[PDB]
């Protein structure tokens, strides 16, 4: 026997939490189609955007990084309800 | 996957360089560099690590090619081809390790020369944001390549199929090791 | 110079052609031949050539190699300490990795091109990942730490080298160039900041040393930390002196903070290897500060102290390895009665620990005196700060010795004939340097 | 129950099948302790019990930042004194806002 | 394998029992107390720093007063 | 120096100056100057005007993030099953709230930056640090303990990173050429160009 | 008998160890001790730090009373009934140079003020 | 008074108080000659209150005597040298047998001694 790290939580509760990821999985093509379409239009529009200060650009990148939600996060928490 | 992730690129780079198809926007290469590096670090599957490495690098290469550095992109594509050949056509652990190291950019291998050409081009344009992003993203990518090295020699016993069809694979590994000193003039 | 470089290239080459059963004997003979070639290089180095004793080029700026005061001392130290590492390691795989690491390190010291320097020092990156992360006795965490820290620092150094090669047109040390840019200075500095452990970038070192084999730990502490001083003297001070003078209050703050925090952290350590590792981190601060003063007294003092550390730290790591082989423990709490049970191991341990505390008959004393004199030349307070806080090293060393010295033990754990043979060169070298043949 | 493994004459063989335990290097290993081993594990893996609390922030800032601030202030004072002592013009340090460009003294010049 | 956790009671009659235990809780000084003692002891340790600061301030103040008086004497005259 | 007797590096005379010599006989510039739009947006004189010019960026980023999250929710919902609830009513708050929060944070950052620069009267790093700190304070209003310290730091650091590598870096390293003779050292005998190299034409996309 | 005396062995650890167990020094003999005696556990003589401080508070004034008078209340003229040792001019001038000398307190001398300012010299080197 | 003393029954507590007081008489004395009168005085002090039956008064006496014996603890207890707390305790402790000595250590697999790098 050897010293081991203590695992927070009960075994069945952790397994139940892990089981909330086992949900119908959409195909990634649906997301990709929209991202490709809007991305092409976005690239066309970007050429006409006004020149922004580097500081403003960096701040916008920070805000976007903070506000980005990982696909797994929505997947785990999605509920088909009002 | 190997032949269509390398060969097609040369034609596009030639078209861009010769037909003056460059933009002032650096967002797309910066995005590719960061997305690719972070996605390479978070990817469980080894095919995804290799696929996202090409995204990151081709983003950086795109940034370098817009500024007129055609020679460096044509030398990079050739080194990248030789580096990717041995990792993709995996048969021997050693060949795959030398390939991963070359893609990573370790100095004893030809991959170092290829990465060096791009990094050297970046310092000439003198864009600070690109250089900072490049350093951090390269570190993140390096973690993924270390993961690949760990998987082969430090995780579990590895048994692979005996596909003894190393047409140009031995030559590519030799060209990666040996080629650094002849091509040192470029960088 | 040419003989030394040729022997260096032959040592990795020899392994490819050996019988796989004669590997250890051949490797030892090659290491001794490399030491003798280094002695020949010293013989063929005339003091009359004040700037560079010898410069050789093999067709390109990258293949420009040369020896100076710093380079000569570090190269002789590497050649002196490698045989010990060789005998301590068993197995063709281990020998191959160690010989490749040594060849890369020894070629880096004599390199005079920044890009070639980078190519040679960072070649030994995967080999350390594999060595520190070995199957049973290694830790993946330590390997990842050392590898990532090295990659990030060396990449910054590489970016600075690329800018210098673009702007000046050459990156060879022999061509006089000066730069006032702060971004480029920072790029070159960050490598030195990480390689020579300085707070807060010192975390990689202790993990690597603890989970490295004794040959690896001996090589790391003995010479790998010194590679920073070669980069400073050869690739930083000539070009970026203005930035070191501009940032001197910050440099001093970071170096003194490293010395203090490392000393305090050494007090909470229960593992012998971690104690030796944190002692090294504390000792590196004086060397870094002394060189940054850009004075004759400082550069000489820093190199001398580096040699003293490169003679005292391998000894402690060797004794710790011998003890661990005898007992399979590094916990100070389990090790007791070592005075009575190992009078011969204990004598050498006490001698080396006295050396680590910079006592007068040891090289550390002379080196410290010179470094403190250089600091006093800068400011009296600078010297006083370092001198006062040296007591913390005494507290931890005394506590360790006291815990090990006495108690009840039922195991006779003393060194064998092989273990005494391995430390005898280090003991003799320590004594000789201590008496003033620095 | 024990036998001498080592042979000085060089005719050393490992009797792996010997009923009697060889007196090899493993004979002198020290017996570990279940509680000491767990203490060692807890000491090394002390990052698990780290918690960000106001007391922790206070202690860190007061000792680490406080020492760093004191050290910077002392170094700045010593630099100012040396500049006054040497007779050099106020040097352009990194964070100092000085309308002077002086950094490295000219060796040829007499100050 | 592991060492025995059973104690030896051979000398318990001669040298006393081990029943009595330490009362220490094995915890360190309070954060408030530590701040006071660090900011008290460290200045004592750095006595040369304060001596240098004191003398330097006195010198600079004297020099400035000298310059001021010089200016005054050089204006009227 | 590569010796242990004298200090390394060198010293340059402050009295002696070297008259500037042109890099080439004729200088052709392929780098276009800043546009009038860039200068207009960069003008921080009137804080309200500055804020309203620069918020479109924050609004766009918030809209992209909200569209992303809304799409993720929409994709999972099943078309085949009829849903009692209205999907748009569920999804519209996501996008609106994300856009509003992003715009509010960017407005705070731009306003504080302009107000500090006006009050101080100087363009400085501190203005970015105080704008970032205020934005991070607003971000961490109700968050647990570590976040109040971490967000003001990360947000304050971001304008520092932007200033160092977007403004100071290029101006610092403007002189370096790479062709002909090294900027500082023109005495050395290196090939002298009649014209500067033009590696690319001025961009137009 | 100096050698071979019986000793009691410290019992083997049998419970989870405290995090700061490194503060205890145990060599295997029964009476283990703190790293610094008096840091914790029994205090010698049952005297706390507060008791020692109160003692020092009672003692300090009585001890300092002789020194404070001569050093502060007394003056050079009134400290002693005689002047410092008289020396020939050549000897005296050299002796006056020493800051830690005893000839600097000669009030009778016409160089008293300079000598007194010399005695109260510089705190730290000016250069 | 310590916890171990407090748990003790009344009779054992008074016996302990007498014992400790006698030891402290010894510690504070300058010679054996002083001990005898002081020990007789201590005996008389305990004998005087031995017949008290009022529990409250007995508790007061015990508590006061314990406070006196706590304050008057000597800095230097007079302990025999060979016992715990003594100068010669542990000077040269008797070695136990069954010591594990490895004979001819360097000659056990002499050529292959060293550390190996195992890989997958
Ligand atoms: C209606 C359709 C719905 C779509 C809506 C719009 C459709 C698209 C239209 C136009 C699209 C073009 C532009 C959109 C963004 C470009 C990306 C893209 O399109 O790739 C395809 C992408 C999917 O590609 P994929 O390969 O399948 O997915 C790969 C991932 O692994 C995906 O796997 P994952 O999601 O599970 O993993 C995510 C992972 C992926 O990683 C990334 O997202 C990498 C991106 C990092 C930065 C990107 C470059 C930034 C440069 C921007 C350039 C402009 C500014 C110029 C200067 C800035 C200098 C940096 O990141 C994370 O783990 C989450 C953290 C988020 C960023 C991490 C960085 C944190 C730093 C903050 C520090 C604070 C922490 C301190 C405290 C920490 C305590 C220790 O599609 C999208 O995501 C589009 C959604 C649009 C939302 C973007 C939000 C803001 C957009 C602009 C802000 C710029 C930052 C980018 C943030 C996130 C972008 C992904
Ligand atoms: C024997 C003499 C060879 C010496 C010189 C060669 C030139 C004479 C060619 C003579 C043939 C020898 C082949 C050697 C070179 C191949 C070039 C070539 O052939 O065309 C060039 C030549 C004229 O083009 P050019 O000299 O390049 O100059 C044009 C402008 O200057 C514009 O072109 P540019 O691009 O060169 O412009 C200058 C360029 C500056 O460009 C350069 O500096 C080039 C640097 C040279 C690098 C060499 C490596 C390239 C890899 C290709 C390997 C050769 C494969 C051979 C293929 C053809 C086989 C004959 O500046 C730039 O910035 C552009 C970027 C250039 C790319 C960047 C260079 C990096 C390359 C990748 C290196 C990375 C390292 C990877 C691994 C390295 C490990 C050590 O064309 C010809 O003379 C006629 C072509 C005829 C070929 C086949 C026809 C004969 C048979 C007819 C019927 C066939 C069917 C029957 C089959 C019969 C057998 C069964
Ligand atoms: C002319 C008259 C004749 C006189 C002679 C003159 C000729 C001159 C040279 C001729 C000598 C023969 C060359 C040897 C070729 C094969 C060597 C080899 O396979 O290594 C392992 C091999 C041991 O074989 P093994 O024990 O039987 O088992 C290997 C099994 O095949 C697989 O075992 P595994 O799956 O268990 O793998 C475990 C692996 C653990 O996994 C790893 O660690 C993977 C790490 C990736 C690579 C390591 C990155 C760092 C390497 C740094 C380079 C070392 C030198 C440092 C100096 C700095 C240079 C900038 O550990 C190792 O394999 C050994 C660790 C250290 C060796 C790494 C060094 C080899 C680098 C590349 C080898 C060349 C292959 C070319 C292929 C040609 C056609 C296919 O050979 C050795 O004895 C040690 C390496 C000797 C290195 C000398 C090779 C030169 C490379 C230096 C680059 C400089 C440019 C080249 C110019 C050279 C002079 C012109
Ligand atoms: C200056 C040079 C440096 C720059 C680099 C670029 C220039 C290239 C210079 C040298 C190129 C050498 C390329 C090396 C290829 C290695 C040879 C090869 O691949 O042979 C294959 C060939 O396989 C085939 O498919 C053969 C089909 C065609 C055979 C060759 C075609 C020849 C056509 C004519 C080529 C002449 C060029 C025409 C005019 C230039 C055999 O391998 P396998 O049998 O499939 O498996 C090997 C198994 N094992 C090793 C494990 C034992
Ligand atoms: C106010 C300071 C003024 C002068 C400072 C000089 C000495 C200050 C403190 C002296 C500590 C040295 C004593 C020591 O090392 O011995 C300890 C060993 O203790 C330790 O190793 C603990 C570490 C203490 C060393 C430093 C602690 C004090 C540091 C001073 C200020 C702290 C920080 C200030 C700047 C870093 C053993 O304890 P004892 O039980 O008393 O041994 C005596 C033998 N006998 C059993 C018979 C009684
Ligand atoms: C009879 C047999 C005797 C048995 C044992 C005695 C062993 C040798 C005894 C005397 C030999 C002394 C030589 C040892 C090193 C002295 C080096 C030295 O001081 O000369 C320096 C040479 O420059 C250099 O660069 C020299 C580099 C090589 C020196 C060794 C580097 C460390 C190698 C491992 C340490 C072992 C050393 C032994 C320049 O000296 P200077 O210019 O500073 O002025 C001198 C005042 N300081
Ligand atoms: C906060 C304490 C500072 C921490 C550092 C402590 C000690 C480091 C000293 C290293 C010695 C040489 C390095 C030169 C400068 C580095 C840091 C000096 C302090 C500093 O940041 O000064 C800044 C200027 O430096 C710059 O503009 C460059 C800053 C470094 C860039 C950061 C990352 C660069 C990596 C680039 C990789 C290679 C690029 C090569 C092209 C701004 O000071 P100021 O003069 O504006 O005063 C205005 C204040 N009122
Ligand atoms: C969140 C992170 C941080 C939060 C918590 C930070 C709290 C720390 C604040 C106080 C820390 C110590 C105080 C040092 C700075 C005090 C104020 C700085 C301003 C300053 O430079 O004044 C100088 C302070 O004296 C000096 O030159 C230094 C005197 C103190 C140094 C000695 C005290 C301890 C000694 C221990 C060793 C450390 C130094 C070893 C070398 C004297 O003014 P000036 O005449 O220079 O004029 C220069 C124009 N302002
Ligand atoms: C990689 C750099 C990122 C910074 C890392 C710092 C640690 C992160 C913690 C977050 C804290 C936010 C960032 C603060 C860093 C700035 C340093 C503060 C010094 C300061 O306040 O002076 C300013 C100038 O410094 C400056 O703004 C220029 C100093 C450049 C920053 C330090 C450069 C080297 C740091 C790298 C150390 C290790 C790298 C690993 C991260 C004011 O100047 P002013 O002109 O406004 O004067 C005032 C007239 N109103």
* β-strands D2-4, D21-23 pairing: parallel
> To one decimal place, what's the resolution in Å?
3.0
User: Residue D58 has what DSSP assignment?
Assistant: H
Q: Is F145's CB within 8 Å of D109's CB? A: no
Q: What is each CA distance from H64 to H1, H46, H58, H71, in whole angstroms?
A: 10, 13, 10, 11
The torsion of the CA quartet F68, F72, F77, F80, rounded to 10 degrees, works out to: 90
Chains F and C touch, contact meaning at least 3 pairs of CB atoms under 8 angstroms apart: yes
**Three-class SS of C115-167:** HHHHHHHCCCCHHHHHHHCCCCCCCHHHHHHHHHHHHHHHHHHHHHHHHHHHH
User: Residue E8 has what DSSP assignment?
Assistant: P
d(CA G92, CA D46): 70
d(CA C159, CA B58): 19
d(CA C304, CA C300): 6
d(CA B14, CA B30): 21
Closest of G102, G79, G81, G75 to residue G91, by C-alpha: G102
Query: Within 10 A of B152 (CB to CB), how many other CB atoms are there?
Result: 19
**Three-class SS of G32-100:** CEECCCCCCCCCHHHCCHHHHHHHHHHHHHHHHHHHHHHHHHCCHHHHCCCCCCCCCHHHHHHHHHCCC
Closest of C356, C265, C370, C260 to residue C314, by C-alpha: C356
Query: Within 10 A of E19 (CB to CB), how many other CB atoms are there?
Result: 7
**H or E element: which one contains G23?**
none
Query: Within 10 A of B22 (CB to CB), how many other CB atoms are there?
Result: 18
d(CA C76, CA G118): 55
d(CA F70, CA A67): 13
DSSP string, C256-324: HHHHHHHHHHHTT--BHHHHHHHHHHHHHHHHHHHHHT-SHHHHHHHHHHHHHHHHHHHHHHHHHHHHH
Is C3 within 8 Å of C41 (Cβ atoms)? yes
Closest of F163, F159, F38 to residue F106, by C-alpha: F159
Closest of A71, C93, G106 to residue F73, by C-alpha: A71
Name every residue whose Cβ is closer than 8 Å to that of residue F165 and which is 6 or more positions away in sequence.
Answer: A54, B128, B129, B131, B132
Look-up of token digits 């430390």? C423
Name every residue whose Cβ is closer than 8 Å to that of residue C60 and which is 6 or more positions away in sequence.
Answer: B184, B185
Is B75 within 8 Å of B83 (Cβ atoms)? no
User: How remote is the C-alpha of H59 from its chain's centroid?
Assistant: 26
Token code pair at residue A80: 């088909």
Closest of B35, B29, B119 to residue B66, by C-alpha: B29
Provide residues of A within 8 Å CB-CB of chain D: 1-3, 5-6
DSSP string, B88-107: HT---HHHHHHHHHHHHT-T
d(CA G109, CA G91): 14
Provide residues of E within 8 Å CB-CB of chain H: 15-16, 19-20
Q: Is H10 exposed, middle or buried (0-12, 13-18, 19+ CB in 10 A)?
A: exposed
Is D55 within 8 Å of D67 (Cβ atoms)? no
Is C51 within 8 Å of F3 (Cβ atoms)? yes
Name every residue whose Cβ is closer than 8 Å to that of residue A12 and which is 6 or more positions away in sequence.
Answer: none
d(CA D35, CA B42): 38
Instruction: Give, in degrees to the nearest 5, the angle at Cα C394 between C317 and C286.
Output: 75
d(CA C5, CA C106): 9
Name every residue whose Cβ is closer than 8 Å to that of residue B84 and which is 6 or more positions away in sequence.
Answer: B2, B5, B6, B50, B54, B99, B103
List residues bridging with C67 in a β-sheet. C54
Establish whether residue C97 lines the binding site of ligand 3, counting it when its CB lies within 6 angstroms of any ligand atom: yes
Name every residue whose Cβ is closer than 8 Å to that of residue C183 and which is 6 or more positions away in sequence.
Answer: B128, C160, F169, F172, F173
Q: Which approach determined this entry? A: cryo-EM
d(CA F84, CA A80): 10
Q: What is each CA distance from E66 to D80, D86, E77, G124, in whole angstroms?
A: 20, 20, 16, 21
Query: Within 10 A of F192 (CB to CB), how many other CB atoms are there?
Result: 13
Task: Print burial letters for H44-82: b (CB count within 10 Å at least 16), e (below 16).
Answer: eeeeeeeeeeeeeeeeebbeebbeebeeebeeeeeeeeb
Most A CBs within 10 A among F33, F42, F75, F127, hence the mutation to make, goes to: F75
Ligand 6: residue of C76, C83, C305, C367 to mutate (most ligand atoms within 8 A of CB) is C76
Phi and psi, residue B141, nearest 5°: -65, -40
Token code pair at residue F180: 């002909």
Ligand 5: residue of G22, G24, G27, G36 to mutate (most ligand atoms within 8 A of CB) is G36
* Nearest neighbour of G124 by CB, restricted to E6, E28, E52: E52
d(CA D77, CA C379): 10
Return residues 35-74 of E near D (CB < 8 Å): 35, 38-39, 42, 46, 49, 52-53, 56
| Atom 79 of ligand 1, residue of closest alpha carbon | F150
d(CA G103, CA G92): 8
d(CA C279, CA C397): 9
d(CA F66, CA C27): 65
d(CA G98, CA G115): 10
**H or E element: which one contains G15?**
none
Residues of G in contact with D36 (CB under 8 A): 13, 17
| Atom 14 of ligand 9, residue of closest alpha carbon | F157
Closest of B110, B123, B68, F186 to residue C161, by C-alpha: B123
**E strands, C26-89, in order:** 54-57, 64-67
Q: From the CA of E73, how many Å to the nearest CA of chain C? A: 37
3-state DSSP call for residue G125? coil
Q: Is F176's CB within 8 Å of B126's CB? A: yes
3-state DSSP call for residue D4? strand
Rg of chain E (C-alpha set): 33
User: How remote is the C-alpha of C354 from its chain's centroid?
Assistant: 19
How far apart, in Å, do the first and last CA atoms of chain B sit? 30
Cis ω on the peptide bond leading into residue C200 (within 30° of 0)? yes
* β-strands D21-23, G24-25 pairing: unpaired
What's the C251 CA to ligand 9 centre distance in angstroms? Answer: 15
Phi and psi, residue G7, nearest 5°: -135, 155
The torsion of the CA quartet F167, F173, F174, F180, rounded to 10 degrees, works out to: -160
3-state DSSP call for residue G9? strand
How far apart, in Å, do the first and last CA atoms of chain E sit? 99
Phi and psi, residue G9, nearest 5°: -90, 135
Q: Which atom of ligand 3 is nearest to the CA of C126?
A: 49
3-state DSSP call for residue C197? coil
**H or E element: which one contains C28?**
helix C23-43
List residues bridging with C57 in a β-sheet. C64
User: Residue C68 has what DSSP assignment?
Assistant: -
* Crossing angle (nearest 10°) for helices C69-88 and C23-43: 160
């Amino acid at each position: 026997d050897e010293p081991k790290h203590q695992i927070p939580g009960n075994a069945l509760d952790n397994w139940a939490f892990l089981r909330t990821y086992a949900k119908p999985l959409p195909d990634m093509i649906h997301y990709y189609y929209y991202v490709y379409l809007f991305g092409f239009f976005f690239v066309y529009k970007v050429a006409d955007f006004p020149e922004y200060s580097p500081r403003v650009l960096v701040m916008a990148a920070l805000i976007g990084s903070l506000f980005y939600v990982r696909r797994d996060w929505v997947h785990r928490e999605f509920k088909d309800s009002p | 996957a190997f032949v269509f992730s390398t060969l097609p690129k040369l034609s596009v780079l030639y078209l861009i360089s010769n037909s003056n198809i460059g933009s002032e926007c650096v967002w797309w290469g910066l995005i590719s560099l960061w997305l690719g590096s972070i996605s390479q670090y978070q990817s469980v599957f080894v095919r995804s690590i290799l696929l996202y490495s090409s995204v990151a690098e081709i983003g950086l290469v795109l940034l370098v090619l817009q500024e007129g550095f055609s020679w460096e992109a044509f030398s990079w594509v050739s080194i990248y081809f030789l580096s990717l050949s041995g990792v993709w056509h995996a048969n021997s652990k050693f060949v795959s390790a030398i390939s991963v190291a070359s893609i990573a950019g370790l100095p004893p291998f030809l991959g170092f020369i290829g990465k060096a050409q791009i990094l050297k081009s970046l310092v000439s344009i003198n864009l600070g944001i690109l250089i900072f992003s490049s350093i951090l993203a390269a570190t993140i990518s390096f973690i993924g390549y270390l993961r690949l090295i760990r998987l082969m020699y430090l995780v579990s016993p590895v048994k692979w199929k005996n596909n003894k069809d190393s047409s140009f694979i031995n030559w590519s590994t030799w060209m990666l090791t040996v080629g650094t000193l002849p091509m040192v003039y470029s960088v | 110079m040419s003989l030394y470089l040729f022997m260096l290239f032959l040592q990795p080459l020899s392994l490819s052609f050996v019988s796989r059963s004669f590997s250890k004997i051949s490797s030892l003979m090659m290491s001794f031949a490399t030491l003798w070639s280094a002695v020949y290089m010293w013989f063929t180095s005339n003091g009359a050539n004040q700037t560079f004793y010898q410069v050789v080029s093999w067709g390109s700026d990258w293949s420009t190699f040369g020896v100076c005061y710093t380079s000569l001392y570090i190269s002789l130290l590497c050649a002196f300490i490698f045989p010990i590492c060789v005998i301590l390691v068993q197995g063709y795989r281990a020998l191959s990795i160690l010989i490749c690491i040594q060849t890369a390190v020894s070629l880096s010291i004599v390199s005079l091109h920044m890009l070639a320097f980078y190519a040679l020092f960072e070649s030994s990156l995967l080999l350390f990942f594999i060595l520190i992360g070995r199957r049973k006795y290694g830790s993946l965490s330590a390997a990842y730490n050392i590898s990532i820290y090295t990659f990030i620092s060396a990449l910054g150094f590489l970016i600075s080298a690329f800018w210098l090669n673009w702007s000046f047109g050459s990156v060879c040390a022999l061509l006089p160039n000066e730069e006032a840019n702060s971004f480029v200075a920072f790029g070159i500095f960050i490598l030195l900041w990480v390689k020579a452990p300085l707070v807060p970038f010192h975390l990689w070192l202790p993990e690597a040393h603890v989970y490295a084999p004794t040959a690896g730990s001996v090589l790391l502490a003995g010479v790998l930390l010194k590679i920073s001083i070669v980069g400073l003297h050869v690739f930083f001070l000539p070009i970026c002196a203005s930035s070191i003078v501009k940032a001197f209050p910050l440099i001093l703050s970071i170096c003194l903070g490293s010395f203090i925090f490392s000393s305090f952290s050494t007090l909470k350590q229960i593992d012998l290897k971690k104690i030796v590792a944190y002692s090294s981190i504390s000792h590196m601060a004086i060397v870094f500060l002394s060189s940054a003063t850009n004075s004759g007294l400082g550069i000489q003092g820093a190199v001398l102290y580096c040699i003293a550390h490169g003679l005292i730290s391998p000894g402690l790591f060797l004794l710790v390895g011998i003890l661990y082989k005898n007992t399979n423990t590094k916990l100070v709490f389990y090790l007791r009665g070592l005075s009575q049970q190992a009078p011969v191991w204990w004598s050498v341990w006490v001698f080396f620990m006295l050396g680590n505390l910079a006592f007068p008959l040891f090289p550390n004393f002379i080196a410290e005196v010179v470094c403190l004199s250089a600091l006093f030349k800068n400011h009296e307070l600078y010297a006083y700060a370092f001198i006062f806080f040296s007591f913390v090293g005494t507290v931890y060393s005394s506590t360790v010795l006291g815990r090990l010295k006495g108690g009840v033990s039922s195991q006779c754990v003393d060194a064998s004939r092989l273990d005494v043979i391995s430390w005898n060169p280090l003991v003799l070298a320590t004594v000789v340097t201590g008496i003033g043949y620095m | 129950s024990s036998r001498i493994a080592g042979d000085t004459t060089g005719k050393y063989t490992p009797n792996i099948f010997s009923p009697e335990t060889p007196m090899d290097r493993s004979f002198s290993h020290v017996p570990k302790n279940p509680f000491w081993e767990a203490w060692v594990f807890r000491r090394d893996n002390i990052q698990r019990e780290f918690v960000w609390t106001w007391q922790t922030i206070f202690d860190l800032a007061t000792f680490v930042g406080g020492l760093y601030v004191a050290m910077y202030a002392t170094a700045s004072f010593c630099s100012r004194q040396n500049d006054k002592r040497n007779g050099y013009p106020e040097r352009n340090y990194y964070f100092s806002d000085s309308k002077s460009n002086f950094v490295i003294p000219d060796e040829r010049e007499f100050y | 394998n592991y060492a025995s956790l059973k104690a030896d009671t051979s000398m318990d009659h001669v040298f006393g029992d081990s029943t009595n235990k330490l009362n220490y809780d094995f915890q360190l000084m309070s954060s408030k107390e530590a701040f006071f003692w660090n900011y008290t002891l460290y200045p004592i340790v750095g006595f040369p720093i304060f001596l240098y600061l004191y003398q330097f301030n006195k010198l600079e103040n004297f020099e400035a007063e000298i310059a001021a008086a010089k200016a005054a004497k050089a204006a009227s005259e | 120096t590569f010796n242990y007797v004298i200090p390394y590096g060198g010293s340059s005379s402050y009295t002696i100056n070297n008259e500037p010599v042109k890099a080439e006989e004729v200088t052709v510039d392929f780098s276009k100057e800043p546009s009038a739009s860039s200068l207009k947006l960069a003008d921080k004189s009137d804080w309200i005007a500055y804020t309203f010019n620069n918020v479109p960026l924050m609004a766009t980023v918030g809209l992209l993030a909200g569209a992303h999250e809304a799409f993720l929710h929409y994709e999972r919902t099943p078309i085949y099953g009829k849903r009692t609830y209205n999907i748009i009513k569920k999804l519209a708050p996501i996008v609106i709230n994300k856009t509003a929060y992003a715009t509010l944070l960017g407005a705070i950052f731009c306003a504080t930056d302009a107000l500090y620069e006006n009050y101080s009267g100087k363009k400085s790093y501190t203005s970015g640090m105080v704008a970032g700190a205020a934005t991070g304070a607003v971000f961490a209003i109700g968050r647990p303990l570590p976040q109040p310290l971490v967000w003001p730091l990360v947000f304050a650091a971001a304008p520092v990173i932007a200033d160092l590598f977007g403004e100071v870096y290029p101006e610092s390293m403007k002189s370096a050429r790479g062709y002909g003779t090294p900027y500082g050292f023109e005495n050395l005998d290196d090939a002298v160009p009649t014209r500067n190299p033009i590696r690319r034409n001025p961009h137009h996309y | 008998a100096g050698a071979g005396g019986p000793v009691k062995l410290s019992p083997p650890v049998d419970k989870p160890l405290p995090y700061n167990y490194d503060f205890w020094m145990d060599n295997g003999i029964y009476p283990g001790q703190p790293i610094y005696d008096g840091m914790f556990g029994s205090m010698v003589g049952n005297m706390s730090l507060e008791y020692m401080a109160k003692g020092w508070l009672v003692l300090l004034p009585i001890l300092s009373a002789p020194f404070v008078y001569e050093h502060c209340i007394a003056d050079d003229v009134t400290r002693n009934p005689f002047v410092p040792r008289q020396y020939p001019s050549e000897v005296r001038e050299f002796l006056a140079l020493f800051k830690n000398g005893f000839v600097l307190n000669d009030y009778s001398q016409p160089d008293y003020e300079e000598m007194k300012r010399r005695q109260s010299g510089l705190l730290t080197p000016i250069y | 008074a310590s916890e171990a003393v407090l748990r003790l029954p009344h009779k054992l507590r008074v016996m302990r108080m007498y014992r400790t007081g006698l030891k402290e008489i010894v510690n504070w004395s300058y010679g054996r000659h002083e001990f005898y009168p002081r020990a007789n005085a201590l005996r008389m002090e305990f004998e005087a209150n031995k017949e008290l039956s009022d529990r409250e008064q007995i508790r007061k006496l015990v508590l006061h005597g314990e406070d006196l014996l706590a304050r008057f603890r000597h800095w230097e207890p007079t302990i025999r040298s060979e016992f715990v707390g003594g100068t010669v305790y542990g000077v040269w402790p008797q070695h136990c047998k069954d010591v594990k000595f490895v004979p001819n250590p360097a000659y056990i697999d002499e050529f292959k001694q060293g550390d190996t790098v195992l890989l997958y």
